[PDB]
Amino acid sequence: PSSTFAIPQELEKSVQMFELFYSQHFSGRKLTWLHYLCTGEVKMNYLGKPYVAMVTTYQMAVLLAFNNSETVSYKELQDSTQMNEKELTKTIKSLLDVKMINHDSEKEDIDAESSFSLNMNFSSKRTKFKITTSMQKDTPQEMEQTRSA
Amino acid sequence: MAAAVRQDLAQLMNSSGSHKDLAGKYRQILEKAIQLSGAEQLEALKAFVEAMVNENVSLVISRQLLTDFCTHLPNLPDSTAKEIYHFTLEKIQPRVISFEEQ
Amino acid sequence: AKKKRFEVKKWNAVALWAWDIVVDNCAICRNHIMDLCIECQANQASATSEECTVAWGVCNHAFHFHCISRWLKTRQVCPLDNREWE
Amino acid sequence: AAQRYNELSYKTIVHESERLEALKHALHCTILASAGQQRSRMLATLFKDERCQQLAAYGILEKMYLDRIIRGNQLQEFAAMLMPHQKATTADGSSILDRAVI
Ligand SMILES: [Zn+2]
């Protein structure tokens, strides 16, 4: 089971709209839902040279927060999201350990505010090591966890 | 002209402020005006349904206030409720994935 | 300023499998829905991986012929797909 | 449908009006078609019911039981006892009832 995600319009148009045409593609080859392919590549001309890159999930919401206001408070926000918190223990461990993410405040039970900071980080701290970022844990760890299974 | 009530609720929508602004304004003003009678009742039903279409009005605010709207549902006559369910289906089927409960 | 501020990624957790079209095994007697049954041995039809002995057309309630028919003969309402038995 | 309605009329968990409702629809399924063999077995099982003697068309089931050629009189009797969708003459000449009477 995964959490409940809002899935915005671009996410909608990527997948759901696809579901429309998918009926056109396959009529009779039905759907088993898989969100995982939500794709994202950013070509941004913030600075003279369009850059194609990939980044994390939260600040996008922050960007949305910025368009509307400066902040999105966690109370209403939490009211809106309601993630299924099965995985949350592992998630919390990862978010706390990383500290690469520009966040408002990482508390144990509830993070009171999710109106995250600006682009604080670049690829690495050091060159020998102390290298590690994008957020790795979900990625190789799944089998690591799954071994029992 | 008949565009007066639509113009008033459109002026109450013309605020480019936060989601808290538009959401609080339409929660209070259309909890007032939905529970009225007549053309302002009908247009408040339509304008609350149309106010809960956004993604800036993020979805379980829309879902929760539409659960609240489905609890306010017996305050309404039947034909206005019919048109509510028509236009509300018309807003759901864009994001019916998000509003399967609705 | 604004060069990498966390917009759309590919992200994967575990979803599926095996799928959730059910689709079920002709349950009156339940040789596997790929498997050629006894009732399709004297018949020996080219049978689909979801067709043990299944014809859901107008006949619509078609399981293992004499076993679905034995569930048919003692009372003619054979209710799993709810029609007469093939 | 005859076995459906009859053995729903014999069960005792259901309301009594609903038992005799299933029973009278089993009598509808008696008269509307002509007798197949297990059908006729269920019709004679219906003939052993005092509640069917409480029904309006027990004389029709009686003439079914006594192997009687149905004349127009009791024909029109149970034709007064039908529902109008069960009175369907869908371009078959005489009705499904009446062709089965023949
Ligand atoms: Zn076999």
Ligand SMILES: [Zn+2]
């Ligand atoms: Zn067979």
Ligand SMILES: [Zn+2]
């Ligand atoms: Zn099969």
